[PDB]
Design a protein around this ligand. Structure first.
Ligand SMILES: [K+]
Ligand SMILES: [K+]
Ligand SMILES: [K+]
Lengths: 387, 121, 66
């Protein structure tokens, strides 16, 4: 019907057609029985002693056929209450939130089994038990120790004391140890191998305990935290495998590059702290969001290095002391100049090279500057979205 | 090497940066001019400031143009540098200035760019 | 040298910067932590990257922290 309905919101008068309301009949206004309570027969209107500003959006939702936009002037908490009041339903509410920037967290899978729940709770919620918290500290301590130890392995006071520290020979034990960072022995003579094994024992332990106490074993490698947990132990076991499969000086020498690579991979254990850091996590989400801008920054920079490193090269090419050997060589200069680090290990000497130089700087200052706003945002979002 | 720009036909981003510059030219312009005023001025004082030293790294005023820029853009290679208390006071300023000069266009660009960008993607 | 901070009793600005830090500690904190993660990580790769050169300027990983 086109019969006209007057809704009085705390004195503010609204009118619509009954067929506009009838459109959604699960709602307060759309259901005769539900709105009956608010009807004033003396004035032929439904009266609501309720917030005024919110209403148009509520009425427009009917007139628009579904559009529920919160007025700019209305607080999200007051509006959502009004929505609840008028019984617009869970669908409208969800869309509204989503559009309002709130993502459903859904629900977390549960073990059911008493044991897993018992365990899973102190391995992923420090909250769950005072003991659960204790474990957390230990995990942080072990991570920090594994880092300090990995670093100390490179200190000359330690690496530099060996059977051929004075150029004398290479010993296979000395050679492997040097590459690996520690001496892999059953004897467990080397302290570094001890600490590393201890640390990796724990790390291995966490990973295992989580893999068997988790509700789902399907959404396990999807989680980045578990990936990190694995990456944190992969180097150790792979090194063992590699050394025992090439227990000869020539053989080792033939796989040394890989061993070296895993050694470097060990530093990723740093990211294990992200399970205990909100901030790390916030920066985590912040990057993932920004990838596209974070991407362009790289590409723009690329264009600028190739271009600038290219002009400076030729600009200095006829000088007998060009610090720029080839164009790909000057790639280094370009970056260092554009990021304004400016070591000085390379530098144009010519009026031509210097004009490029100047620009190359001023450009990098502006290129680099672009993503900044983006990140502040995504980050400033995910941050105030927790803390 | 301009063949690099052929990629702009396949890059939205390149295009977005493309439009972003064209818009900003006026600010992008001033940045250059301000910088110019600042190089001539600063490279000029540092020169005289070090002129009486027997090891001035600044030969002429136009020579120190290089120093000025590198200092104002805070790159600071170090291939040239004041040795004198006078030259160093100029130096300090020259830096702090370039930090603020350079800083100005930034807002402009974020805008034009942030425009043309969200005007596609 | 901390006597320098005695000027803060006569400087509004010093005071304003004073309050400004105290507020920001949490962000001021993360900046430090992030930086830490980044130094250990980066100083670590550069070390190994130059380890086989006979003129590595990076002696140890903690050295390259600088
Ligand atoms: K700089
Ligand atoms: K610099
Ligand atoms: K520098």
């Amino acid at each position: 019907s086109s019969e006209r309905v007057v809704i009085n919101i705390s004195g503010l008068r609204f009118e619509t057609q009954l067929k506009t309301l009838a459109q959604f009949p699960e709602t307060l206004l759309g259901d005769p029985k539900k709105r009956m309570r608010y009807f004033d027969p003396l004035r032929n209107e439904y009266f609501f002693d309720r917030n005024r500003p919110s209403f148009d959006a509520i009425l427009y939702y009917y007139q628009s056929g579904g559009r529920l936009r919160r007025p700019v002037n209305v607080p999200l908490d007051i509006f959502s209450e009004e929505i609840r009041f008028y019984e617009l339903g869970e669908e409208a509410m969800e869309m509204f939130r989503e559009d309002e920037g709130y993502i459903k967290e859904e629900e977390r899978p549960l073990p059911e089994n008493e044991f897993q729940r018992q365990v899973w709770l102190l391995f992923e919620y420090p909250e769950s038990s005072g003991p659960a918290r204790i474990i957390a500290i230990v995990s942080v301590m072990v991570i920090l120790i594994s880092i300090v130890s990995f670093c100390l392995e490179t200190l000359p006071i330690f690496r530099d004391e060996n059977e051929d520290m004075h150029g004398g020979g290479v010993t296979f034990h000395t050679y492997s140890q040097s590459t690996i960072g520690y001496q892999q022995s059953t004897s467990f003579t080397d302290p570094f191998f001890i600490v590393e094994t201890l640390c990796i024992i724990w790390f291995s332990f966490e990973f295992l305990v989580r893999f068997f106490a988790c509700p789902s074993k399907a959404g396990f490698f999807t989680n980045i935290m578990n990936i990190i947990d694995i990456v944190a132990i992969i180097p150790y076991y792979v090194t063992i495998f590699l050394t025992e499969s090439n227990k000869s000086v020539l053989q080792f020498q033939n796989v040394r590059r890989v061993v070296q690579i895993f050694r470097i991979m060990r530093i990723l254990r740093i990211f294990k702290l992200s399970r205990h850091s909100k901030g790390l996590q916030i920066l985590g989400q912040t990057l993932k969001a920004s990838m596209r801008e974070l991407g362009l920054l790289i590409f723009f920079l690329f264009i600028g290095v190739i271009l600038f490193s290219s002009a400076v090269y030729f600009a200095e090419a006829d000088e007998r002391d060009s610090q720029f050997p080839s164009i790909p060589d000057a790639f280094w200069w370009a970056v260092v100049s554009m990021t304004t680090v400016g070591y000085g290990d390379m530098v144009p000497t010519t009026i031509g090279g210097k004009i490029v130089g100047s620009l190359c700087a001023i450009a990098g200052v502006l290129t680099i500057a672009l993503p900044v706003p983006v990140i502040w945002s995504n980050f400033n979002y995910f941050y105030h979205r927790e803390t």
